[PDB]
Ligand binder design. Structure first.
Ligand SMILES: *C(=O)c1ncc(Br)cc1OCc1cc(Br)ccc1Cl
Ligand SMILES: *C(=O)c1ncc(Br)cc1OCc1cc(Br)ccc1Cl
Lengths: 298, 285
């Protein structure tokens, strides 16, 4: 019973979070095996961030300029290299707490948990979606850079935080930004954002599963005309296929739930609520809904 | 910036979760030092328990405790209120510094939702004024715990039962929160009001993050009509008043008139003043 925005348990990620200092600049880094990953802007001074020349700033750095602490212990750095927008510090000890892990680039509309960190120490954990425009609506203060996002006994790291634009932007663990962003203190346009349609649909399924059925009353090509109108992502057959399991478990056909949603979009909610929300929620994937509704564990 | 319902990091609790089996009943237990804690209804079959009689028919070896692959050896069992305490022959080497704490209504904690001794997820809950919680709890989640962290984990909640709707449980001494008992009967939770001091803390969080529009001066008279907990609550809200230069209750206009605040089309009451400050200033653990 109940339905909650639920983060993954964070223990395996917590044992990977270290502090990285370079100059006055300090942020979080991710220690897996003998490599520490962090945003390359750890090397920028106050004046550098407006237009940093990362190649030329890194040239002025030596291994011993990088202070890496994993708790009270200090790691010694035996090599440094830049891969796109992430710095990779080789250190002489492999992390004993390294989990089984992969590095993944998620697709827009996919969700992950963020372990917000400061000075290499965890502060909290929360579930996020990658917006269609490759920003994320998170909770990130000064110093949170290098906090990571992930999905789970194997941790798939998908996101490292790099900058607050009120929305947030960063990279995969190969240092490639999500979206058009660059790592410089400039104004940068995020796209026109849209609602993640397949996720709203999944969340309506969760609603029906938990007893909220008041909204239950089209064609794919026709629903998409409505979706386009309300700045919703178009629905593809791939999305319909991924909604399969929930359609079977609940016994409502996906194009039927789509007619329900069209009505919600064209008519609003009349001050009613769905799963305790007065807006349509789009930060649950069809996997998340299934995960939670069936209690899968890690 | 930004503002999210944030759960505490769960690692220190994950190392404490175990599977407890009695008969053909399995749920979650909490292994700290040489003691495993779980709901005493682990000893109940499917067929109004007399727990003392049921426990009397149970011996130490009828309780199977697993920590991952390791199986612990029970060497003692007492019942304190509604918790079973199984003394095991092994202290948990992953026991964190910890306290047992009984929270007050309107306070918040993190739930590490678990099935068969294994972590499913973590989320932030508020103890509702009527001593239920609105969580996400399936059959099997019993024994999952609620907690706050300060290197010290304060356990405040053990899950005992899904009501028709919401959730109920105990403190780690086995005393239920609220008027509930560990029996499968219809049990009423009283009317549940809104946590006024929490909604105010959330409005400060909103102002800190730039949501300004809702700013427009006993007159509690309105709170009573809209079923809000009566507004000492000012003293707790002090530091937010000092940070923003704003005690705001004139929320009155919100209640009577009804756009979004911090991305919600509802007034939110599951952030305590402490939560807002922790989050808006980067408290770590
Ligand atoms: C970002 O989270 C962050 N935290 C701490 C510190 Br010392 C710096 C930092 O980044 C600042 C930043 C990065 C970028 Br790519 C663009 C603008 C800014 Cl202000
Ligand atoms: C509750 O979360 C739970 N999970 C798994 C199992 Br095997 C049993 C269980 O409790 C069932 C229960 C407890 C109570 Br105090 C009242 C009614 C019910 Cl159904």
């Amino acid at each position: 019973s109940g339905f909650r925005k639920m983060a993954f348990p964070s223990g395996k990620v917590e044992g990977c979070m270290v502090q990285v200092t370079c100059g006055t600049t300090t942020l979080n880094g991710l220690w897996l095996d003998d490599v520490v990953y962090c945003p390359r802007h750890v090397i920028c001074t106050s004046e550098d961030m407006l237009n940093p020349n990362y190649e030329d700033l890194l040239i002025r750095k030596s291994n011993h300029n990088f202070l890496v602490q994993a708790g009270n212990v200090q790691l010694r750095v035996i090599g440094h290299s830049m891969q796109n927008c992430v710095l990779k510090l080789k250190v002489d000890t492999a992390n004993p707490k390294t989990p089984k892990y992969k590095f993944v680039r998620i697709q827009p509309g996919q969700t992950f948990s963020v372990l917000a960190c400061y000075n290499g120490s965890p502060s909290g954990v929360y579930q996020c979606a990658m917006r269609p425009n490759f920003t994320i609506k998170g909770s990130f203060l000064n110093g949170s850079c290098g906090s990571v996002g992930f999905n789970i006994d194997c941790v798939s790291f998908c996101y490292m935080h790099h900058m607050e634009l009120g929305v947030h932007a960063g990279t995969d663990l190969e240092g490639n930004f999500y979206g058009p962003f660059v790592d410089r203190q400039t104004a940068q346009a995020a796209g026109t954002d849209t609602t993640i349609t397949v996720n709203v649909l999944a969340w309506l399924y969760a609603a029906v599963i938990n007893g909220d059925r008041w909204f239950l009353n089209t064609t794919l090509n026709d629903f998409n005309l409505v979706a386009m109108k309300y700045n919703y992502e178009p629905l593809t057959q791939d999305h319909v296929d991924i909604l399969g399991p929930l359609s079977a478990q609940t016994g409502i056909a996906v194009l039927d739930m789509c007619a329900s949603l069209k009505e919600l979009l064209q008519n609003g909610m009349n001050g009613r609520t769905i799963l305790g929300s007065a807006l349509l929620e789009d930060e649950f994937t069809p996997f998340d809904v299934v995960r939670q509704c069936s209690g899968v564990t890690f």
